Design an enzyme around this catalytic site. Structure first.
Site, PDB file in Angstrom:
ATOM      1  N   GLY A   1     -27.204 -30.827  -9.926  1.00 54.49           N
ATOM      2  CA  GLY A   1     -27.045 -31.404 -11.245  1.00 54.49           C
ATOM      3  C   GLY A   1     -28.340 -31.499 -12.025  1.00 54.49           C
ATOM      4  O   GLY A   1     -28.565 -32.490 -12.736  1.00 54.49           O
TER       5      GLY A   1
ATOM      6  N   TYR B   1     -32.584 -30.241  -8.976  1.00 52.12           N
ATOM      7  CA  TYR B   1     -33.134 -29.116  -8.230  1.00 52.12           C
ATOM      8  C   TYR B   1     -33.440 -27.919  -9.120  1.00 52.12           C
ATOM      9  O   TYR B   1     -33.857 -26.870  -8.610  1.00 52.12           O
ATOM     10  CB  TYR B   1     -32.162 -28.680  -7.125  1.00 52.12           C
ATOM     11  CG  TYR B   1     -31.795 -29.765  -6.139  1.00 52.12           C
ATOM     12  CD1 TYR B   1     -32.605 -30.881  -5.960  1.00 52.12           C
ATOM     13  CD2 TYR B   1     -30.635 -29.669  -5.380  1.00 52.12           C
ATOM     14  CE1 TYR B   1     -32.269 -31.865  -5.058  1.00 52.12           C
ATOM     15  CE2 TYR B   1     -30.292 -30.653  -4.476  1.00 52.12           C
ATOM     16  CZ  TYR B   1     -31.112 -31.748  -4.316  1.00 52.12           C
ATOM     17  OH  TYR B   1     -30.768 -32.734  -3.412  1.00 52.12           O
ATOM     18  N   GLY B   2     -33.234 -28.052 -10.424  1.00 55.67           N
ATOM     19  CA  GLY B   2     -33.378 -26.892 -11.312  1.00 55.67           C
ATOM     20  C   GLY B   2     -32.146 -26.014 -11.234  1.00 55.67           C
ATOM     21  O   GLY B   2     -31.008 -26.494 -11.236  1.00 55.67           O
TER      22      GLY B   2
ATOM     23  N   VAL C   1     -30.085 -23.897  -9.007  1.00 52.42           N
ATOM     24  CA  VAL C   1     -29.794 -23.671  -7.596  1.00 52.42           C
ATOM     25  C   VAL C   1     -28.296 -23.442  -7.453  1.00 52.42           C
ATOM     26  O   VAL C   1     -27.486 -24.135  -8.082  1.00 52.42           O
ATOM     27  CB  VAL C   1     -30.255 -24.861  -6.724  1.00 52.42           C
ATOM     28  CG1 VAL C   1     -29.997 -24.574  -5.254  1.00 52.42           C
ATOM     29  CG2 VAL C   1     -31.725 -25.149  -6.964  1.00 52.42           C
TER      30      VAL C   1
ATOM     31  N   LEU D   1     -26.005 -26.455  -7.844  1.00 54.01           N
ATOM     32  CA  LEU D   1     -26.323 -27.534  -6.922  1.00 54.01           C
ATOM     33  C   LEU D   1     -27.393 -28.434  -7.513  1.00 54.01           C
ATOM     34  O   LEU D   1     -28.369 -27.951  -8.097  1.00 54.01           O
ATOM     35  CB  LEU D   1     -26.809 -26.990  -5.572  1.00 54.01           C
ATOM     36  CG  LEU D   1     -25.862 -26.085  -4.784  1.00 54.01           C
ATOM     37  CD1 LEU D   1     -26.551 -25.601  -3.513  1.00 54.01           C
ATOM     38  CD2 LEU D   1     -24.560 -26.799  -4.450  1.00 54.01           C
TER      39      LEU D   1
ATOM     40  N   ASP E   1     -42.899 -34.391  -4.058  1.00 50.24           N
ATOM     41  CA  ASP E   1     -41.536 -34.785  -4.396  1.00 50.24           C
ATOM     42  C   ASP E   1     -40.786 -35.298  -3.174  1.00 50.24           C
ATOM     43  O   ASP E   1     -39.570 -35.139  -3.070  1.00 50.24           O
ATOM     44  CB  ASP E   1     -40.782 -33.616  -5.027  1.00 50.24           C
ATOM     45  CG  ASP E   1     -40.620 -33.771  -6.528  1.00 50.24           C
ATOM     46  OD1 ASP E   1     -40.763 -32.758  -7.254  1.00 50.24           O
ATOM     47  OD2 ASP E   1     -40.348 -34.905  -6.980  1.00 50.24           O
TER      48      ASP E   1
HETATM   49  C1  LIG Z   1     -33.851 -29.744  -2.639  1.00 50.27           C
HETATM   50  C2  LIG Z   1     -34.199 -28.629  -3.597  1.00 50.27           C
HETATM   51  C3  LIG Z   1     -33.574 -27.381  -3.513  1.00 50.27           C
HETATM   52  C4  LIG Z   1     -32.552 -27.090  -2.472  1.00 50.27           C
HETATM   53  C5  LIG Z   1     -31.311 -27.705  -2.490  1.00 50.27           C
HETATM   54  C6  LIG Z   1     -30.369 -27.404  -1.488  1.00 50.27           C
HETATM   55  C7  LIG Z   1     -29.085 -27.993  -1.440  1.00 50.27           C
HETATM   56  C8  LIG Z   1     -28.230 -27.626  -0.418  1.00 50.27           C
HETATM   57  N1  LIG Z   1     -26.939 -28.144  -0.271  1.00 50.27           N
HETATM   58  C9  LIG Z   1     -26.291 -28.991  -1.098  1.00 50.27           C
HETATM   59  O1  LIG Z   1     -26.790 -29.406  -2.127  1.00 50.27           O
HETATM   60  O2  LIG Z   1     -25.040 -29.356  -0.741  1.00 50.27           O
HETATM   61  C10 LIG Z   1     -24.446 -30.513  -1.368  1.00 50.27           C
HETATM   62  C11 LIG Z   1     -23.604 -30.114  -2.595  1.00 50.27           C
HETATM   63  O3  LIG Z   1     -22.402 -29.529  -2.018  1.00 50.27           O
HETATM   64  C12 LIG Z   1     -22.144 -30.183  -0.743  1.00 50.27           C
HETATM   65  C13 LIG Z   1     -23.355 -31.110  -0.449  1.00 50.27           C
HETATM   66  C14 LIG Z   1     -23.029 -32.554  -0.815  1.00 50.27           C
HETATM   67  N2  LIG Z   1     -28.601 -26.742   0.503  1.00 50.27           N
HETATM   68  C15 LIG Z   1     -29.776 -26.165   0.512  1.00 50.27           C
HETATM   69  C16 LIG Z   1     -30.713 -26.466  -0.478  1.00 50.27           C
HETATM   70  C17 LIG Z   1     -31.980 -25.850  -0.485  1.00 50.27           C
HETATM   71  N3  LIG Z   1     -32.323 -24.931   0.503  1.00 50.27           N
HETATM   72  C18 LIG Z   1     -32.877 -26.166  -1.475  1.00 50.27           C
HETATM   73  F1  LIG Z   1     -34.089 -25.570  -1.473  1.00 50.27           F
HETATM   74  C19 LIG Z   1     -33.937 -26.391  -4.419  1.00 50.27           C
HETATM   75  N4  LIG Z   1     -34.843 -26.613  -5.346  1.00 50.27           N
HETATM   76  C20 LIG Z   1     -35.452 -27.785  -5.464  1.00 50.27           C
HETATM   77  C21 LIG Z   1     -35.150 -28.829  -4.592  1.00 50.27           C
HETATM   78  N5  LIG Z   1     -35.773 -30.075  -4.685  1.00 50.27           N
HETATM   79  C22 LIG Z   1     -36.337 -30.299  -6.020  1.00 50.27           C
HETATM   80  C23 LIG Z   1     -37.223 -29.092  -6.364  1.00 50.27           C
HETATM   81  O4  LIG Z   1     -36.378 -27.937  -6.444  1.00 50.27           O
END
Ligand SMILES: Cc1c(-c2cc3cc(NC(=O)O[C@H]4COC[C@@H]4C)ncc3c(N)c2F)cnc2c1NCCO2
Ligand SMILES: Cc1c(-c2cc3cc(NC(=O)O[C@H]4COC[C@@H]4C)ncc3c(N)c2F)cnc2c1NCCO2
Ligand code: NA
Lengths: 290, 290
Positions: free
Chosen positions: B20, B23-24, B26, B18, B132
């Protein structure tokens, strides 16, 4: 300032890349006509870099007469690539030297510190900051002169700050105080004074403090509230003046850190017996050993 | 806090990365037992990592019950990696949404701003700074709730710094003030208030101000003396309260920028009729146009 608009390879032949990347793109070269050995530094030019500003900065470098600044011989512009021709130091940096000769004597370190301070005071007098004082960046020319390279040009600082942008990330959402901090990067003239204190330890022990701890952990250690300035590890081997020089230069608070000018009145750099000879002995030891 | 020291691959089926890279590391994963979908963030641990600091940091996220912070479901430590289990948002971030629905309405942006402000107020109360705040990092679950992620733990901070060491250089010679800045020192939590004001503009115009400019050139402009805080482009399109919300959140000096708590009293975010129904409509629009 008469910066040549010619391919510098029209006049020189590259022989050897210098620094292993730590200096950037820097080459040992040979004057095709005279056969003289020079050092050519290539600063990639961005289309944004105003050549008007470059001309002003180069003029300052061309007119420099300070005995502790690397000598400027000329510059070239070709294919958006700026080349700067300087003296070539067969001995190289102090790091190249102590990796062979070993630990430098206290007097030799004292001479180096005095000469670097004199150069730092000249740079600071131009509102310039070196930012990378260390054994690898202090050069000993074939005549035993201690010199710093003056690369105070926007195109070079722009390249350094280009890596700083990859470090902080995208800026569009950043607050002004975050952008201002990231840009400056904490660098200030008195940071060269701290860096010199560390260099004196480097020259005395062949590596800076905490060199046995990997960088990430050292960054966290350095930024602990109770972080204490390092010191020399062998007390008896050094005079109280040397220890005091370290103590004073390695002042944690920048406001209370002495300037390059004030440091020049310190016992260690003002003591008698500091003369070029000390470096000539070191060069002899490097070329011929024990 | 009971950080399970078992292989998390035994309890979840990894389906797809997740973000690209933004988010690192994920992954969207499924609980092998309950079948519920979760989001796992994989944090690279250092062999040095102090586990006592880690536990103290996970307990805070575990006992968190804030409506505007992504829920913590549990964590795993395995093979030098920390996996953090969180709720999964099928709609992703506001960025993933407005890239399909187009700009948000002022009422939808007002709701997003109140909820983010609520989450910021919580993190700032814990002496945490988000740093961020942006559409990409504001998540929307299927119920229409707006949630920030709280990754305020040392392992994550060290993890992200280890990735950026290549762009900053060796630290052994750096002065304390230089090391402090490289580790994100020098500013306040109020920087998040600025980032939300930019985000408000982002949600209304699909782009932060100056997105069509090179990031380096933007930085220079922000540091210029007379830098003007950005505003919304089309004045008629937005209310006087939204314009004022942008004006106060984008206060240049941080000493005058209001806190998250103080902003929750602003008209734009204290107006009645702000509820997840606004987002449930945006999610419907995301599902089938109109
Ligand atoms: C934001 C973040 C996250 C993080 C992403 C998430 C994404 C999704 N869902 C998702 O992406 O869904 C789409 C792709 O598929 C269908 C949708 C279009 N859910 C829960 C998440 C969640 N709990 C997270 F913590 C993890 N690490 C991060 C950051 N911010 C930068 C610093 O590191
Ligand atoms: C220091 C620096 C330079 C720079 C290096 C030079 C090296 C040498 N000599 C040398 O290296 O000799 C060894 C290889 O062969 C024998 C020795 C072991 N001479 C002249 C130089 C000169 N004028 C320079 F400006 C160029 N850019 C830099 C830096 N510092 C970091 C920022 O960018
Ligand atoms: Na705008």
């Amino acid at each position: 300032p008469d910066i040549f608009n010619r391919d510098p390879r029209d006049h020189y032949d590259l022989l050897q890349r210098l620094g292993g990347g730590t200096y950037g793109e820097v080459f040992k070269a040979r004057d095709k006509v005279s056969g003289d050995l020079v050092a050519l530094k290539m600063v990639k030019m961005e289309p944004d870099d105003d050549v008007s500003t470059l001309q002003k900065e180069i003029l300052i470098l061309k007119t420099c007469r300070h005995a502790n600044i690397v000598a400027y011989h000329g510059s070239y512009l070709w294919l958006q690539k700026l080349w700067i021709c300087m003296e070539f130091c067969g001995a190289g940096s102090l790091q190249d030297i102590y990796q062979v000769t070993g630990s430098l004597s206290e007097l030799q370190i004292s001479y180096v510190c005095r000469e670097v301070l004199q150069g730092l005071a000249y740079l600071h007098s131009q509102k310039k900051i070196h930012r990378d004082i260390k054994g690898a960046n202090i050069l000993i020319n074939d005549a035993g002169e201690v010199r710093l390279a003056d690369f105070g040009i926007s195109a070079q600082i722009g390249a350094e700050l280009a890596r700083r942008l990859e470090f902080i990330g995208t800026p569009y959402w950043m607050a002004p105080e975050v952008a201002a901090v990231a840009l400056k990067g904490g660098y200030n003239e008195l940071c060269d004074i701290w860096s010199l204190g560390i260099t004196a330890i480097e020259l005395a022990e062949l590596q800076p403090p905490l060199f046995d701890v990997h960088p990430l952990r050292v960054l966290f250690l350095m930024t602990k509230s109770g972080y204490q300035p390092p010191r020399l590890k062998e007390k008896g081997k050094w005079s109280a003046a040397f220890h005091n020089f370290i103590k004073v230069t390695l002042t944690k608070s920048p406001k209370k850190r002495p300037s390059a000018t004030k440091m020049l009145s310190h016992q260690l750099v003002s003591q008698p017996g500091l003369n070029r000879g000390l470096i000539l002995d070191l060069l002899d030891k490097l070329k011929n050993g024990n």
